[PDB]
Design a protein around this ligand. Structure first.
Ligand SMILES: Nc1ncnc2c1ncn2[C@@H]1O[C@H](COP(=O)(O)O)[C@@H](O)[C@H]1O
Ligand SMILES: NC(=O)c1ccc[n+]([C@@H]2O[C@H](COP(=O)(O)O)[C@@H](O)[C@H]2O)c1
Length: 321
């Protein structure tokens, strides 16, 4: 075989082997038989026999038994800045935001209403349909690399599902929230106490702590969930509206909430706020408000963002008990 083909074959076989090492050792959830894996590793070691320049301390052949999977939280840039949200706590504040929106873009704006989860923000990047990076918010330009931890989350697919309706983008940065269900928060605290560790005081702290683990195998043992609620940088995907982008996220296998609705104007927004004020306790994870977003992407650009926040979105937060 020629040297280009040698380097091609090595990279592909090293990556396939490393992925199964991760799934077996960190996730404890292999997806091929031990017999299959053993053939893979033999072929890889054979190929490194011929070409010993390919054998590095970094090779999966040198990182056997689960070695070499540690998270170090190194800073990593978001592709597009990941801002926080301005908040509204009163009917008046929300109407004021609604008025400013109308005065700038008129009735052409409609309002996506989503449930606000009290969890830990996570930004995922997929390149050519494969997960390459996951990071915390950090300061909005730069977050901490927790890629390996996120790869253990059951709701986070490693690969996006192709479909002719919605082609897999070349690059997709998708934002979302990690959290625990209430029943799993309690069960994890019981487990922790049984081992002599302190329980967590709330499910948010518990999710953050469970995600931010130097050894991702700890994260893999915990029932972290995720729900996508936003788009950063995308290439090869130009959705006209946020609600239509959720259709593509679903088609690709990414988790989305079933409690999002599309409203026409402020009266429709107020009804969803009133409704979830009465029923949010029925959701099996923590909801602390309702995020109202202008749905039309073109109008999102026109209205822009400030240094710290989008002008086309507001979080209505409920008063704490
Ligand atoms: N459904 C959602 N849509 C957008 N952002 C959300 C959502 N849920 C949580 N967040 C993030 O949660 C933060 C809201 O701040 P907080 O008042 O502390 O709830 C925002 O900065 C968001 O980026
Ligand atoms: N099924 C898999 O994906 C997978 C991956 C990595 C290691 N393994 C198994 O782990 C073990 C390697 O450890 P020993 O070869 O030291 O037993 C073998 O059983 C190997 O097959 C399995």
């Amino acid at each position: 075989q020629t040297a280009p083909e040698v380097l091609r074959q090595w990279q592909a076989l090293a990556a396939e082997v490393r992925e199964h090492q991760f799934r077996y050792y960190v996730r404890d959830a292999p997806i091929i038989s031990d017999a299959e894996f053993d053939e893979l590793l033999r072929r890889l070691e054979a190929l490194e026999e011929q070409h010993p320049e390919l054998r590095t301390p970094d090779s999966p052949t040198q990182l056997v038994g689960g070695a070499g999977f540690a998270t170090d939280f190194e800073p990593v840039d978001h592709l597009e800045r990941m801002l926080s949200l301005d908040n509204a706590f009163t009917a008046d504040e929300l109407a004021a935001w609604a008025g400013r929106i109308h005065a700038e873009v008129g009735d052409a704006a409609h309002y996506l209403c989503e449930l606000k989860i009290d969890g830990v923000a996570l930004s995922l990047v997929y390149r050519e349909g494969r997960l390459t990076r996951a990071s915390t918010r950090g300061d909005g330009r730069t977050g901490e690399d927790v890629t390996l931890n996120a790869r253990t989350i059951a709701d986070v697919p490693e690969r996006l599902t192709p479909g002719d309706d919605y082609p897999v983008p070349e690059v997709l940065e998708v934002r979302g929230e990690v959290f625990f269900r209430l029943d799993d928060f309690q069960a994890l605290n019981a487990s922790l106490v049984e081992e002599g560790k302190a329980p967590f005081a709330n499910p948010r702290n518990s999710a953050a702590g469970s995600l931010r683990q130097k050894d991702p195998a700890v994260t893999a043992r915990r029932r972290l969930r995720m729900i996508c609620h936003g788009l950063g940088h995308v290439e090869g995907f130009r959705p006209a509206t946020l609600h239509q982008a959720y259709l593509a996220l679903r088609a690709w296998g990414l988790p989305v909430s079933e409690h999002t609705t599309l409203a026409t104007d402020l009266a429709g927004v107020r009804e969803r706020i009133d409704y979830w004020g009465e029923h949010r306790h029925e959701v099996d994870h923590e909801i602390d408000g309702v995020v109202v977003k202008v749905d039309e992407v073109a109008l999102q650009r026109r209205l822009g963002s400030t240094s710290r926040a989008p002008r086309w979105a507001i979080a209505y937060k409920y008063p704490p008990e």
